[PDB]
Amino acid sequence: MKKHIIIKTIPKKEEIISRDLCDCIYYYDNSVICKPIGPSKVYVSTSLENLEKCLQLHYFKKLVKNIEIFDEVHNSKPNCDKCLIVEIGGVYFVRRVNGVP
């Protein structure tokens, strides 16, 4: 299942990391999307397993500090309350709280 992942990178390398991660993941998932999204942050949409196959290569291990996994992305303010909403670019990432009816 696709997730909406924010990767924290070292400073100044967002654009190259986005480009190179998309060229690595394409083999596993021809539908991947990547973009640089803020200072020290890259967006990727793919399954977590496909991301990790690439993030464990030597080249990416050096450049990536952490990741944050979200369930949804919206271009307008989301309407949920029982959730975490993070705005990066002018894009809204949502992580839902489990067990809400």
Residue numbers in the entry: 1 to 101
List sentences quoted exactly from the publication behind this structure.
Recently, genomic evidence has implicated a critical role for disulfide bonds in the structural stabilization of intracellular proteins from certain of these organisms, contrary to the conventional view that structural disulfide bonds are exclusively extracellular. Considering the apparent abundance of disulfide bonding in P. aerophilum, proteins containing multiple cysteines in their amino acid sequences would be expected to have a high likelihood of containing disulfide bonds. To test this, a 98-residue protein containing six cysteine residues was selected from the P. aerophilum genome for structural characterization.
Although one disulfide bond (C80–C83) fits the sequence of a potential metal-binding/active-site CxxC motif, the C22–C34 and C24–C54 disulfide bonds do not fit any known metal-binding or active-site motifs and appear to serve structural roles within the protein fold. In every case where more than one cysteine is present within a P. aerophilum protein of known structure, a disulfide bond is found. Some organisms have evidently modulated their internal biochemistry to enable disulfide bonding as a key mechanism for stabilizing their proteins at high temperatures.
